[PDB]
Amino acid sequence: GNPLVYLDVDANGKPLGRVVLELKADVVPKTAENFRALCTGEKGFGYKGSTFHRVIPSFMCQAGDFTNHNGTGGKSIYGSRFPDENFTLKHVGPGVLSMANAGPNTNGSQFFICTIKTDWLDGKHVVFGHVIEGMDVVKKIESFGSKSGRTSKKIVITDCGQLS
Ligand SMILES: Nc1ccc(CNC(=O)NCC(=O)N2CCC[C@@H]2c2ccccc2Br)cc1
Numbered sequence: 001g002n003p004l005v006y007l008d009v010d011a012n013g014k015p016l017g018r019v020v021l022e023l024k025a026d027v028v029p030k031t032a033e034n035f036r037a038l039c040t041g042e043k044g045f046g047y048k049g050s051t052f053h054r055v056i057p058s059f060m061c062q063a064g065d066f067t068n069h070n071g072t073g074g075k076s077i078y079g080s081r082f083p084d085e086n087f088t089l090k091h092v093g094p095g096v097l098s099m100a101n102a103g104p105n106t107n108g109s110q111f112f113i114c115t116i117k118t119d120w121l122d123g124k125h126v127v128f129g130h131v132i133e134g135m136d137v138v139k140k141i142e143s144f145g146s147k148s149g150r151t152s153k154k155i156v157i158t159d160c161g162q163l164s
Helices: 029-040 135-143
Strands: 004-011 014-023 052-056 060-063 096-099 111-114 127-133 155-162
Touching: 004 029, 004 135, 014 029, 014 135, 029 127, 029 155, 052 135, 052 155, 060 135, 127 135
Parallel strands: none
Antiparallel strands: 004 014, 004 155, 014 127, 052 060, 060 111, 096 111, 096 127
């Protein structure tokens, strides 16, 4: 079936707990596979140790720049960037997992988890999964954001991997 992966997240060195994500490989296999492998780190790089760099309350929590650690970087398992696979899944509400980008066909490793329905991103960002468990952790992360996106705590993915 679809992969289940996890992110264990600290804020200021304090564990918040675990976010478990279903990756919709049935719908977006290439995008799911990228995220899965970045969680396990099996290609020699990935999300472990990277941060949530942009968090906007009543919007989303964005993470995944493990190359520049500032929101400008990241890379996929395929190369630096890869195409928008499809826009079949929509930004339907809180918990949606979707790819950050710098315009069409610029998926790398950066991703976001929605905290509301972000319908204006439909057809622009590739949705590829959702939160199975740990929305409480996502709400904590959200509470450490700000309007500008600047975080008020250092939010770090300390560990990550594949559950199934
Ligand atoms: N591969 C790669 C991906 C993203 C980037 C930086 N781009 C980026 O942060 N763009 C904004 C973006 O992807 N998102 C996700 C929803 C949160 C933020 C957004 C999107 C649309 C409108 C406002 C905002 Br903030 C650089 C390289």
